[PDB]
Structure formats: structure tokens, C-alpha cells
Nucleic acid binder design. Sequence first.
DNA 1: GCATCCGTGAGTCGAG
DNA 2: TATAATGGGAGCTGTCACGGATGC
Lengths: 452, 346
Amino acid sequence: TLLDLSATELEQVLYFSKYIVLDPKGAILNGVPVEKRQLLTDEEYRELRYGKQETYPLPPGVDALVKDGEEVVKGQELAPGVVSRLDGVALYRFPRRVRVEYVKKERAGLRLPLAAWVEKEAYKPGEILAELPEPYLFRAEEEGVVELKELEEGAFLVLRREDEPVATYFLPVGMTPLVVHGEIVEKGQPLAEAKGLLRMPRQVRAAQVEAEEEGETVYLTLFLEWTEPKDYRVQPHMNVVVPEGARVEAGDKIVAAIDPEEEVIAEAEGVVHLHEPASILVVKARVYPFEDDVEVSTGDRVAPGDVLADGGKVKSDVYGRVEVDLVRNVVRVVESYDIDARMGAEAIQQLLKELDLEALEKELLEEMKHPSRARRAKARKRLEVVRAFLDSGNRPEWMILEAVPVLPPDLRPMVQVDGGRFATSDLNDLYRRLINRNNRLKKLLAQGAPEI
Amino acid sequence: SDPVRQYLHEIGQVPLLTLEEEVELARKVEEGMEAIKKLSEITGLDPDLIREVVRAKILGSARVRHIPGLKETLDPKTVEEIDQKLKSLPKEHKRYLHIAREGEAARQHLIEANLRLVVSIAKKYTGRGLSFLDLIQEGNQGLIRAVEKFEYKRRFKFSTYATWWIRQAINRAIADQARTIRIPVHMVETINKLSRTARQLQQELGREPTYEEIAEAMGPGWDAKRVEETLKIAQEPVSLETPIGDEKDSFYGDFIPDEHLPSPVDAATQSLLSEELEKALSKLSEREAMVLKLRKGLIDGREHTLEEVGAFFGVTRERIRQIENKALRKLKYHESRTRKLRDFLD
DNA sequence: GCATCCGTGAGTCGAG
DNA sequence: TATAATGGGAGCTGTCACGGATGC
Ligand SMILES: [Mg+2]
């Protein structure tokens, strides 16, 4: 009656069915702003206080249609069998395999008929290298054993006489190699056949082009740059210590593990790609990558216009809770209000302390002049309690117990009956329940127990 | 409405971990602890205080309370000072703070995810003297111990290591709380062992065993008397509100007299005794009566020595002893004469 | 404005 | 102290008449 709370509601708050809000800090549920003494469910309080998020399963063998760190809109399919019910930043959970694209910058020669070759200072991927009217046989200018390295498209030949390579030839798309791996070739025997138009592969680009005119032919020394993929399998007991698209060097570790021999170490300079996550986590959050030391740690709560990282450069957009990602090197703010919503007799005691009696008496007095009979009735019933407390000098919050009194022991005896057996009052068992639960509560608090 | 149902719902909220989720959480917890130790090395502060601060900021200011082990009272002021002192550290050092926070969060999520196990284990301990919810909560304490003690390196799933500590906490709770008159855990073990022994013995004897048979089955050191006394100390009290008769109008406690407070007869008898003793002492002189009242404790209630009454009346202890003697003697004569104080001797 | 819910009452000794 | 174990379990049903609080 005092706080204007129906029996069901007070039941819900005292017995921890529902939260009640104090100093809402401007939370918003379903478009409607939040004001004091509002009744929030568990899902509502969790969405408001801890932010909104979800995780989705990926069936075995299927890969992602989205990338790590990438913003996502509701309805957008993360997989063929997975559609996100919300909008936000998708994140990878437990990638099964890590692909590493290894950077390789080398030098390789080729010889072509002068009429066919289209002269350029460099060649972009896919760009036509030459146009040949008739089939042409590219021949070995050295003797030795052939190392055939085949890319997705395009090939490399390496002639090594001594086991020391004496030659490197590049075979762009349109040239079918006539040699196998480890084949012994003499000088001037065809290593390949060029047919029609020959062009650069999509995997490899030609950075520099030198050309020596000799007789009716040109010899192109090509300075090439390309990436070679290598797949690594990650077991459930292993974790990925490297972010998506991270530049790595020889000696660095991509994936850790229980024991050092099963670890994944990077063999050469290359970029890291995370594929086939166990699950995908969609969160409503704002991403803030950082290039330097971060001013706020994990768990801190922050408003828009707050210091985050890099000595005060990158700041906060929305309201939320700070998760500092060292792996991805990004400060990620999951959007959540600071709203204070409590449960139980502590909340109630707080609201009770916050009642100004004279004010409420005035309110109810102004309510007593209303034409409606029911309103006058309820206002009378309330004003009776209000004026009871007012006249008495009793503080309303005394209807909550901080300290539970204990009856004198002789009024709840423990007595030895005739036969030496003991008989005692139930009040002792009640008090023992009370003290056990209270003590366990203090120990659970001191030990930092979870909220449930 | 139904507290158990409500709690089972709140538990049903948090979804079960996968192998990877579990491994990652455990790992983050462990590395978090390591990071706290590192921060203790760097800062030269108390690891426990640091842990309480990191846990404070993770849980928020919603929960802050003085920890019994901590030296300083834990309040938003001190945790702000310590937090800022942690913000005062170089990038590689400040890293360990983030590791710690992540560790705490992982801990919380781990416990919250594993709350179902505790219930599934506790449901089998009912009827042993603790409520279902109590068994659940104590089991939760066990779960917390298991979380803080877990090693993911062993590659064992969490449930295996958790179950041990959970059963441990539930059983400790049952042994500690279940009796209105508390009994030590080892003694509870002995009593339960005696019970199981007697039950097996009765199961093979086709009847309840005697003390001697139980003593035989318990081994050396156990005789009939030991079994009997062990069964005696094991006896639990009975309710004073225990109903008597088929109606609701009679309590068992209504038949139990108060032996403590003196009866009107006893009180009156002590009164007449005091009055008569005064009557008899008045037949002596002031000095001998006072000496007797001092030595016997009628004055301050304590019984003075000879040296005290002697120094009080200013005579030798031999003298005061002598006047005590003659006082008692005159009292004896007068008592033989009037037979007044005889009836108070029962 | 009127059905329906919940809470709370329902004799005294005596003995058991 | 380490295999793994992950949402419980009885209700108790033949009065009654009232008063006062919620719901069409
Ligand atoms: Mg024996």
C-alpha cells in the first residue's frame, strides 16, 4: 500500500521473480524509455544490463559466409543453414582450421617470340603476357634436374644440376609443362608448350619486368610476388593466439596447445585466415581497433564520449560494457545501460527509505477530491497507512529486517526430560535454518559467487 | 511459487558448454590466476587484494564487502585506488590486468554454466536432514572449489573433477548441519559406520543385534559399553511441540515440570532457615556471630580465612579460630536445648 | 456494478 | 583431489460462511 505495489508485484520482487529499477540511467526496452519503479523480467534486465547477444551452431564441414569482426544485419545468413535473428558484430568461435597465405617474392625467367610478347614494364594478375599465333615450345637454357611447383594456376620450374638450382622458369597460364617433377633435362629440350594467348595467373603478380632481346626472341626476367597457402588443423584443446589477417614472421606461433610439439609455429612471412569456426557469435557491439596502450580494462562500464585507447584518441560511441580483446587487438564495447535494478527486501527497503511522507500525504489529499469513487477509496486506504506512520513516528523501512531478533533461550528451552533424553522447541530449528542460510550467504558473498 | 522450480528455471537459462567452450573458460581462468600472481610480483602487493579488486570491477560496485582475510576494508575508494595503480603500469604489464579480468569473467561463466551438475548430484542426497535447496547450495560451494582448483592441462572434462568436490561439500554439509546438537564429522562417521554395521548384522541375523554382536563386528577396541555409549551420544532431541492425543489441544511439553526455579515450599523453607539461623546467632555476642557469618559466608557470600577475620577484628588467627570454636560450641548447646534447627536438616 | 479468489474463523472441563 | 557424470518430486481432493481484495 505504501509503495503502491500490488501483492503479486511485491511477491515478485521480494522472492526474486522480477527486478525493480532505481536510477535507470536511461535504459530503453522495445522503444520505450525506462523510469524508476518499473518491473523488469530476467530476460529484460539481462538485455538491458548485459547487452543483447546470441551464438549459432555450424554443422560439420560447412564454412562461414561471413568474416570475423564483420558487422551483420538481421536476417543476413551467416551460413547456408544459419540466419542471425539480430544485428551486430559477428565473431568467430573456435575455428577448426587455420589457413596461412605465405608471402614469396622471387625471380624467374621466360623466353618468348618477339612478335607474340606484349611489352609492359609490369604485369598485374590476369593481365595477358603474350599472344601466340602458333604453338611454341619453350626450351631449357640449362641442364639439370627439374623441380616442378604447381600453383592453383600457373607453374614454376627449377633446374638444379648439383642440387644447387641453376635455373628458375615461370610458366604462366596457357603454357602446358612437358616435364614432370624430378625429370632430367638437357640443354634446349622443351620444358613446356605455349598455345594461343598466355596470361598471368590470379594467384601471382609480376612486380618487375626486365627484357633482353636476343635474335628473334625476348628473354623476360620477371620479379614476381605471390602467396602460397598452407592449411593447419586445430583440435578442441588448442586455441588460436593470432587475429584474422595478421602479418606474421618465421618463429611466431599461430596456435598454442597443451604440449609444445603439437604447437603451430609460422614457418615464413604470411597472412593468417581463420576458417571453419565451431560456432558464430552475433553481438550488438561497437568495435574500436587500437594501435597502442588502452586506458580501460575488461568489464568496465562506459558512456558515449569516454576515453578508450591510444592516449585518448579513439573514444566511445554508444553506452556499454568494455571487453578488451588482446588477440584481435581491438577494444570491443558491448552495448548496455548502467541501470540499477535490484531484487528482494533490499530494493524494497531502499524504496521505503526514499519515501517522503508529507509529500505522499499531499498527493493523496489532492487525490481525495477526485470525482471517481474508487480513486477516493484507494487514496483513503493509502492515506490511512501514511498518516498512521506520520502520527506514530515509525519509519516505514522498519518493516524490513536488517537484524532478526533472537528469543531468550529459556522461552525456547532445551531440556533433559526424566529419562535423560532431550526435548526442545521448534524455534531452535527455525533459528538454525536461519543462521545456516545467513552464514552460507556471507561466505558465498565473500567468495565472489555468481548471481544465480 | 515453488522455489525449486524457479531455481531450476534460472539454471535452465544458462546453456551447457561444449568441449571447446569449457576448455577455453578453464584456460582463461588459470591464465588469469597466473596473471594475478604476475601482478603481485610486479606491484609488490597482496595477490588476494589484487584478486578482490579485479573481481570487484568484474562483478561491479553492486557487490563490495570486507573480506575476512583482507587487511584493509574493501570499499569503492580503495578498489579505485588499486585499480588506478593497475592502470599506472606499462603496456606489457597492464596486459596482465586484462588477462585477470578475462579470467574472472571466465570463472563466473564457468560456474554459471555448470550449475546443473550440482542439482543432478544433490537430488540423491534428500532425506538426510537437509532441504533440497540447501543441498543444492552447498553443492554449489563445491562447484566453486572445483572451478578454482581445476587444471585443463589434464585434459579431463570438468564434470569429473567437479563431481568429487560437489559430493564433498554436500556430505560435509550433511555431517555438519543435520543435528540440533552438533556432532564432529569423525564422530558422525563413527556413528554412521555403527549404523551400517548393525544393519548388516541384523540383515544376516534375522533380528536386531545385541551390543555384544555389534561390538564383535566393529573390531578390536570396541566392546558392548563403547557401542552403547556411542548410541547414547547419537540420540537426537524430540520436539516439545510433539502432539499428544488425537486432538490438537495437547503438547508433549505440557507434561514437563520446571526443576530450576525453587518451589514456594523450598523458598519458604530457605526463608525460615535464614530467620532461624539469625535467631540462633542472636544468642551469641556481636563478635562471635559476626565471625561465624564471615567464615561461613553470610556477609559478602565468600568464606573468609582465619587471617582475614583476625585482621578484621584485630586479633591473631589462633584467637579468631578460638572464638569461632566457642561460637559454634554455644550454638551446639543452644541447639541441643531448643531443638529449633533440627528440622531443617531433612 | 458482480462473479470469484484467498484467508480465517468454527464450545468448556476431564485424559491422552 | 582427475574416466564421465549437467532442470525434482509429491499433490489429497465430503464444511462453510464470512469479509475483503481483484476481474469481467
Ligand atoms: Mg570387539
